[PDB]
């Protein structure tokens, strides 16, 4: 019959606690449906106190009723606070040492510290038995973030592999003048080899032609470096890649076979959030 502190997509935390009450004007026999409270990690424990006081019967002493006092305890314990980040997933021990926490402690700070144990206590004044709520683990607090990071990193791959094929089907075509340059030399080889070893004319005649052709290829490269070859012609290569990245209407959500504003910095910005949460809980990720 233990309570829960659940995490939501937003920063809020939903608190399920089964109060043992219901046949009560004042609590000083079926219980009432467990209380579900929505709290923020930045509001103090005193606000969580007056939240539970509203969904609870008054406390009567003699002629007057008064709001019950609520005390939160945790297993907190030589000079370094032993953090585990396991929470309810921890090992548990026979009997634990509890300490009171100040009503000014923010719920977020109190929860991450109490994660050293498997549960934190909630005591309502006037009722002898204390309640138990299982502290969320580090993995619990980052469930929607991790599950969304897995979703982000998978759509990125469905979008990267089409930029991959777009950026590889643009090299076999752009390297056509490189293979043609090799064919020009090998064909020029065969002309020189044939005339020397299969023709009467000697090196007196062919060598100047090989020199005039050498200067021609040098000047051909000078007229080539006199185009967009100087500095970075990647702008011309980027235009061919941009034309190859045509839009596709295949998938309504996570559209396949297209390319645009790849927002990967949110997948990294989300990972920075999950790792910062692991550090304050004192764990690796």
């Amino acid at each position, epitope marked *: 019959t233990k309570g829960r502190l659940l995490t939501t997509p937003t920063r809020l935390l939903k608190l399920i606690l089964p109060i043992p009450f219901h046949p009560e004007q004042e609590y000083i026999e079926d219980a009432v449906e467990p209380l579900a409270l929505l709290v923020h990690p930045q509001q103090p424990l005193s606000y969580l106190e007056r939240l539970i006081q509203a969904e609870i019967p008054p406390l009567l002493v003699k002629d007057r009723e008064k709001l019950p006092e609520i005390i939160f305890r945790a297993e907190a314990d030589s000079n370094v606070a032993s953090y585990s980040g396991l929470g309810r997933e921890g090992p548990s021990k026979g009997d634990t040492h509890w300490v009171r926490w100040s009503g000014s402690t923010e719920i977020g700070d109190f929860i991450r510290d109490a994660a050293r144990g498997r549960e934190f206590s909630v005591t309502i004044e006037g009722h002898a038995e204390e309640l138990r709520v299982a502290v969320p683990s580090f993995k619990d607090r980052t469930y929607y973030m991790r599950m969304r990071l897995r979703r982000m990193s998978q759509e990125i791959d469905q979008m990267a592999t089409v930029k991959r094929e777009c950026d590889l089907l643009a090299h076999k075509g752009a390297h056509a003048l490189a293979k043609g340059g090799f064919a020009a030399l090998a064909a020029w080889w065969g002309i020189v080899y*044939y005339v*020397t*070893f*299969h*023709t*009467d004319m000697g090196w007196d005649l062919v060598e100047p032609i090989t020199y005039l052709a050498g200067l021609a290829s040098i000047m051909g490269g000078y007229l080539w470096f006199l185009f967009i070859s100087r500095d970075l012609s990647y702008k011309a290569a980027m235009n061919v890649t941009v034309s190859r990245r045509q839009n596709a209407l295949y998938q309504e959500r996570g559209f396949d076979p297209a390319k645009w504003d790849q927002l990967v910095h949110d997948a990294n910005g989300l990972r920075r959030e999950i790792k910062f949460a692991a550090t304050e809980y004192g764990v690796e990720w």
Partner: nanobody
Amino acid sequence: VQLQESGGGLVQAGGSLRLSCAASGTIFSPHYMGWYRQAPGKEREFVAGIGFGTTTNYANSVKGRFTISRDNAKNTVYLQMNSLKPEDTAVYYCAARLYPILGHTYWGQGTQVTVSS
């Protein structure tokens, strides 16, 4: 692809003779084409030869007296043999190689040259 020769015959010592051989069946121009002789009992010996990329050399007994000459247009080997002797007597053959593989691959029909004594 094979060669045929024509020009052999009889002539006495100190005479002259011109030898001709025509290569045919080649898609290209052959690299090497030369002349070889065969004494009545000895082996096939080298007389004269012209490799296009390589040398144009004669044999020792041949040097100074005969002249080999190729014309690649008509693809014909010529051997002008002057100052003949009885030791010049042999069956003369036409050998050709399409590529510079040192050795001999293609052979001709053969013409006899006789120098009496």
